[PDB]
Homo-oligomer: A and B are copies of this chain.
Amino acid sequence: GTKITFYEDKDFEGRRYDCDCDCADFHTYLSRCNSIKVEGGTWAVYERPDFAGYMYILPEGEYPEYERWMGLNDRLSSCRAVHLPSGGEYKIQIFEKGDFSGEMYETTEDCPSIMEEFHMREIHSCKVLEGVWIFYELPDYRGRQYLLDKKEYRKPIDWGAASPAVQSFRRIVE
């Protein structure tokens, strides 16, 4: 029901590789990627194989250039589809310090600035109770991205960040 399309050159030119499911490594099929077409659903694309490296969240739409997904280079070699749970419920707990410690807040809302709403410059642990969320490195959903499926996150490395630099977050809705 879903599919994503990669192109080597800008504005949907050049060789192409299709994926309708979670592709773990296609760097042997594409030397680079400068255009992306998403047909159904929301995908997460990773720089390096096995869902590692930098990641980006691309909902249904067209992306003629690599800046349209706030990308930093034309290197992408893995991708996975984002299954959204049914029920409409979104709920997350964020903690000041590691292992679900420190002062904790719970919210069901997008937060464009954590420093202003919760007075925290960093986040070291997290519990995703309902739905799927994205952590952004900078406020107003700019900077590096990190996907958070559900389960629990004890350290910032568990969602893919070296530093605990997280300043905004929001939910994925289709």
The residues of B that contact A21 with a CB separation of less than 8 Å are 20-22
A24 within 8 A of B: yes
Copies of this chain assembled into the complex: 2
A1 within 8 A of B: yes
Count of interface residues, chain A, beta-carbon cutoff 8 Å: 5
Chain A interface secondary structure, helix, strand, loop or mixed?
loop
Which A4-27 residues have a C-beta within 8 angstroms of B? 20-22, 24
In the assembled complex, the CB of A159 is this many whole angstroms from the nearest CB of chain B, namely 16
The residues of B that contact A20 with a CB separation of less than 8 Å are 20-21
Q: In whole angstroms, what is the CA distance A20 to B22 when docked?
A: 10
User: Smallest CB-CB separation from A81: which chain B residue?
Assistant: B21
The 4 closest A-B pairs by CB, nearest first: A21-B21, A20-B21, A1-B24, A20-B20
